[PDB]
Amino acid sequence: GSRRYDSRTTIFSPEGRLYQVEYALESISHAGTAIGIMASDGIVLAAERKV
């Protein structure tokens, strides 16, 4: 709740999920959108860039 220790990964959060993992998904969305494609005859990879 009000008391949160994000410093060490060893400290368990009151919700049960580490807060470093929560905001790590935001850094993923802050970057460019990358789309993987798995095909039968190969793999198609298309992605943008952040800069």
């Binding site: 008391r3 220790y5 060490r8 990964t9 060893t10 400290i11 368990f12 959060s13 009151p14 919700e15 049960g16 999920r17 798995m38």
Partner: protein, 240 residues
């Protein structure tokens, strides 16, 4: 205040961090199993709600430790694969030293010891994923079902329900199941196990993974049509 360290026993006699580890299990996958006289059955729940997901390349929840000993966890998949990997290393180390197959009692003390050493060690996070260790003793058909808890303790149960809605399914296992006379046949233990899983799964097929363990080091995995076959038998009374 007292949730920032593992070295404090807390004023309530229980570490709050251990209780928070159970919250991830309550929101995680479900693990339900019941052992019979000659066999043990371990069910689980794999979430298929994610679209465009290949079930063939996705490893099943039930992992193979020993020929006659399997394992099924409930919780986050990230911390569970380490508990499976560390157990497999000791599973092979038993034959490297004692030459005998994996003992269910010895394997549980090691898996519980993994969470034990990391809990006692300061600055190291333990595992908050509860695992169910089942199997047969060497040259013995007597099933042995053990569990692991975030508190660093192990308890032996004939039938146990963990995960989401653990208390709701537990009421089903304390009435139709009898420890004094467990089901002798394999079909009776598997058919009743599916009915207990239909509560958390709520009419699904690929969301149920059941691995039946047989003596003489035998592992069989029911297919999607074989698992759904027992679902029709349980739901037959509702459509009759």
């Amino acid at each position: 205040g007292y949730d920032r360290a593992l070295s404090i026993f807390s004023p309530d006699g229980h570490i709050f961090q251990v209780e928070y580890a159970l919250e991830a299990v309550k929101r995680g996958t479900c693990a339900v199993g019941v052992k019979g006289k000659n066999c043990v059955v371990l069910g689980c729940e794999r979430r298929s709600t994610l679209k465009l997901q290949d079930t063939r390349i996705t490893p099943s929840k039930v992992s193979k430790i020993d020929s006659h000993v399997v394992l099924s966890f409930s919780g986050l998949n990230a911390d569970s694969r380490i508990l499976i990997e560390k157990a497999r290393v000791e599973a092979q180390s038993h034959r490297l030293t004692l030459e005998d197959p994996v003992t269910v009692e010895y394997l549980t003390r090691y898996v519980a010891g993994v969470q034990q050493r990391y809990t006692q060690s300061g600055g190291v996070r333990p595992f908050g994923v509860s695992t169910l260790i089942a199997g047969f003793d060497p040259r013995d058909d007597e099933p042995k079902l053990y569990q692991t808890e975030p508190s660093g303790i192990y308890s032996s149960w004939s039938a146990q329900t963990i995960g989401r809605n653990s208390k709701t399914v537990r009421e089903f296992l304390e009435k139709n199941y009898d420890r004094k006379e467990p089901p002798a046949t394999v079909e009776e233990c598997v058919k009743l196990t599916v009915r207990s899983l239909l509560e958390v799964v709520q009419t699904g097929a690929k969301n149920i993974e059941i691995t039946v363990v047989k003596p003489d080091s035998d592992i069989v995995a029911l297919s999607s049509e074989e698992i759904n076959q027992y679902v029709t038998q349980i739901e037959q009374e509702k459509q009759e």
